[PDB]
C-alpha cells in the first residue's frame, strides 16, 4: 500500500541532502551526481539521521575510472553504485566549500538560464583520482569513505519504482533530455518536441499528481537557478523519456 504522493524530502525532514541541488558544472558527471546525491540520502535515513553526510560527487567521478565509463565525458550509473559497494566513497560538499572530506573541484555554472556564474562549456576535463582529503578535514580517506551494501536496478514498473523510494529512500534514475525540457520552469514536463540532447541521470525523490496528471519528483544537478529551485517534475506512469528504465539504488553498509 503506497501513498498517492510522497516527497522523501517530508518524510525525513531530518536529512538536509534530500532537499539539496547541486552543481555538476561543465563537465558531464550527471552519472555519479545521481548516485552520490541519492547515497548521501539513503545513509542518512539508513540511519536515522545519526549519520548525515555530502556524498563526494569528486571521489566518484575521479576515482572509480573506466569501469563507470568517462568521468566527464559521460558514464554508466549502475557502475556508481557498483564503486560505491566495492570501494565506497568518501564525503565532499559543494565547490570551494570546504566541506567534507574530497569537495567537488569543478566551479558551478549557469545551465541554460543567465545568472551571476560563468555559462557552462562543453564537457571538460576529468580531474585526477587523489585519494586524500582536504587539509583539516578528518578522518582519513580510507577512515572516510562509506560503503554500499548493495546496488540493484529497479524494474521498469512505476509501482516497484515508488515502494523502493517509499522503503528505501531517494534513487538514480535517468532519461532522454529533449531540447523542450532545457527551459523548465515549472509543471509536469511532457516532452511533445525538440532534439535529443542526450541520456541525463537524475535523483528520484517522490512522486505526485499535479491536476490529474501523475509526475516523479526529481532533483536535477544544474544548480538552484534552473528548473522549480533545482527540481523537476516528470509525467511518470509510462516509461516517458525512459525515466522508468534505468532506475537504480543499493542500501548502506552502516
Partial sequence: KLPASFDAREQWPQCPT????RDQGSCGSCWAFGAVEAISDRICIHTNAHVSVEVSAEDLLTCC???????????????????????????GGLYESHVGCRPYSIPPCEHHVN???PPCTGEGDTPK?????????????????????NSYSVSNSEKDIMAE?????????????????????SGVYQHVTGEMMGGHAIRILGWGVENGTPYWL???????????????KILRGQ???????????GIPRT
Fill in 129 to 149: 583520482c587523489s585519494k586524500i582529503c582536504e587539509p583539516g578535514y578528518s578522518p582519513t580517506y580510507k577512515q572516510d569513505k562509506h560503503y554500499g551494501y
Fill in 65 to 91: 575510472g573506466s569501469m563507470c565509463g568517462d568521468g566527464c565525458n559521460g558514464g554508466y550509473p549502475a557502475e556508481a553504485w557498483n564503486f560505491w559497494t566495492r570501494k565506497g566513497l568518501v564525503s
Fill in 115 to 117: 545568472g551571476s556564474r
Fill in 165 to 185: 523510494i517509499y522503503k528505501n529512500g531517494p534513487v538514480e534514475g535517468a532519461f532522454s533530455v529533449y531540447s523542450d525540457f532545457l527551459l523548465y520552469k
Fill in 18 to 21: 534530500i532537499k539539496e541541488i
Fill in 218 to 232: 526529481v532533483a536535477n544537478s544544474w544548480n538552484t537557478d534552473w528548473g522549480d529551485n533545482g527540481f523537476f
Fill in 239 to 249: 516509461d516517458h523519456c525512459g525515466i522508468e528504465s534505468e532506475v537504480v539504488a
